[PDB]
Every structure is written in structure tokens, then in C-alpha cells.
């Protein structure tokens, strides 16, 4: 969770730039851990 | 009697010593040297989008 | 082993002659009739 | 690494190594061209239980 979590964490202090955009969500089933931008987190801060 | 062996030439060739970076494919990776993967456990990307 | 051994030795002469040249893709190539020019009256049939 | 055969001693090498799907969605596709051979001969051999 976490150890997956942190590296969101880790996204959250950035520098890697994201070039090309579509939907996440189609691609669910090749990523290792998924997280879901809801417009908040309690968790985040 | 005269009657005698002639090695008449060698030939050779030489590896061609392809450079990975002298190569098309190269961005298509950024290639990354990082000589500290031996002592490492694990690594993770995070991906804000 | 970088080695010099097979042949560099003399740059030997040029001279100019009538003859045939295209470009089949970069590999650029002769042309020759062998015919009319040494086999012309020689009974010997062209290979 | 060192493996000493009864035949000679051997070096071998290796090396750790990391690469990353970083595309977020779908990176490179491929396609068929041609054909090329018919591998299989397409049939007449009963099964046999």
C-alpha cells in the first residue's frame, strides 16, 4: 500500500514529465499500483 | 627435385564494434548509468497526472 | 589486434579506357558485351 | 565469476540491469506485413485416439 504509496508521495515532490495523455483507467490492468485523483485525499496530506 | 608449399596471403577481419548510442534506436531509452544496482533492494516510480 | 598484415605497398599506375558505368543502387557497376568484342569471328561460341 | 573446468578456466560476466514501462498508456505498437512461409502443411492426418 504505502511502499506503493510513497512513490505518490514521491510523485507529490515531482520532476517527470508526462508527454503523451489518455485515459488511465484503460490502461488498469498494466500499471503495478493505481491511485485515484477524486478532487481530495485525506490521506495525502 | 625442386617442389615446395606457398602460402600465398592471409586475410582477416575485424569485429565491428557496433556503439549502442551510434545506433537509431536510441531514443527510445533514456539509458541511465547507475552504478549502485548491486547493493539496491528496489526502486518505484510515482506518476502524478 | 589492429594489426597492419594484409597489404599496403605500392599505389600502382592509372590509365584511362573506354568502357561502361550505372548505378544500380548505391553499388555502382561495370557493363560488358563479351561478343562483339573478342568473340566476334573466333568459331568459339559465347558461354 | 570463476568456474576452473578440468578442461580450462573460465570468466564470465554479468551485469544488473532495470528498464520501466514509463509510457502511461500504450507505447509502440506493431503489425503484420507478409507472410512469408506456410509453416504447416494444412491437413490430412486423421487423429489417432
Known amino acids: 500500500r504505502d511502499p506503493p504509496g510513497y512513490r505518490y508521495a514521491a510523485a507529490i515532490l515531482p520532476t517527470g514529465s508526462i508527454l503523451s495523455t489518455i485515459e488511465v483507467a484503460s490502461h488498469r490492468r498494466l500499471f503495478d499500483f493505481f491511485a485515484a485523483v477524486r478532487s481530495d485525499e485525506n490521506s495525502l496530506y | 627435385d625442386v617442389e615446395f608449399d606457398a602460402l600465398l596471403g592471409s586475410y582477416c577481419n575485424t569485429l565491428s564494434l557496433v556503439r549502442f548510442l551510434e545506433l537509431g534506436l536510441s531514443v527510445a531509452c533514456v539509458c541511465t548509468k547507475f552504478p549502485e544496482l548491486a547493493y539496491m533492494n528496489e526502486g518505484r516510480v510515482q506518476f502524478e497526472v | 589486434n589492429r594489426e597492419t598484415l594484409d597489404e599496403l605497398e605500392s599505389a600502382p599506375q592509372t590509365t584511362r579506357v573506354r568502357a561502361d558505368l550505372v548505378a544500380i543502387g548505391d553499388r555502382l557497376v561495370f557493363l560488358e558485351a563479351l561478343e562483339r568484342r573478342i568473340y566476334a569471328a573466333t568459331n568459339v561460341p559465347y558461354p | ?49
Not at chain 4, 540491469?17 to 509453416?39: C, E, F, K, Q, S
Open chain 4, 1 to 49: 565469476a570463476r568456474h576452473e573446468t578440468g578442461g580450462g578456466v573460465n570468466f564470465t560476466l554479468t551485469q544488473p540491469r532495470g528498464n520501466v514501462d514509463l509510457g502511461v498508456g500504450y507505447t509502440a505498437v506493431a503489425a503484420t506485413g507478409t507472410v512469408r512461409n506456410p509453416v504447416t502443411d494444412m491437413g490430412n492426418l486423421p487423429q489417432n485416439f
